[PDB]
Amino acid sequence: MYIAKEGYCYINIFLAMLVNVKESQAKEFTKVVRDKLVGELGKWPTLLDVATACYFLKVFYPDVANAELPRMLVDHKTKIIHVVDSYGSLSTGYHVLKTNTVEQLIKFTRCNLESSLKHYRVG
């Protein structure tokens, strides 16, 4: 179960993590996402701010680091990254951000180099 709402599809990154949290912790995790993170991030948050929230969750739910992420499609014209767990589009190349797991997103985003990509909006 993913969400499909304008500017809030970054929420699917967090939902993708649920497969790596214990059943005894699922309700609590979902409440952190819904009651804390969404309110702080708002609509069309930057990639950096999303990855930063992932890092926050990782320190409390360490197994989440290995969770696979939905496909992330990049529009360099609008500077927007669309989160899609779907069939028909692109698999590789200039329009697909190859951060396949939480840890990969964290690694990309924590680098000292100032990539323009960190500041694209996600949703």
Question: Which residue is catalytic, options 9, 54, 76, 111?
Answer: 9
What type of residue sits at position 25? Q
- CATH tag for 1-123 (out of 3.90.70.150, 3.30.470.10, 3.40.50.300, 3.30.70.20): 3.90.70.150
Neighbours of 119 (CB within 10 A): 12
Resolution (A): 2.0
CA distance 72 to 91: 10
Kindly report the backbone phi and psi dihedral angles of residue 82, in degrees, each rounded to the nearest multiple of 5, phi listed first. Answer: -100, 125
95 is catalytic: no
CA distance 6 to 80: 12
Question: Which residue is catalytic, options 54, 76, 82, 119?
Answer: 82
9 is catalytic: yes
Q: What share of the chain is helix, strand, coil (3-state, %, to 5)?
A: 50, 15, 35
Residue extents of the structural domains in the chain: 1-123
- For this PDB entry, the determination method is X-ray
Kindly report the backbone phi and psi dihedral angles of residue 71, in degrees, each rounded to the nearest multiple of 5, phi listed first. Answer: -65, 140
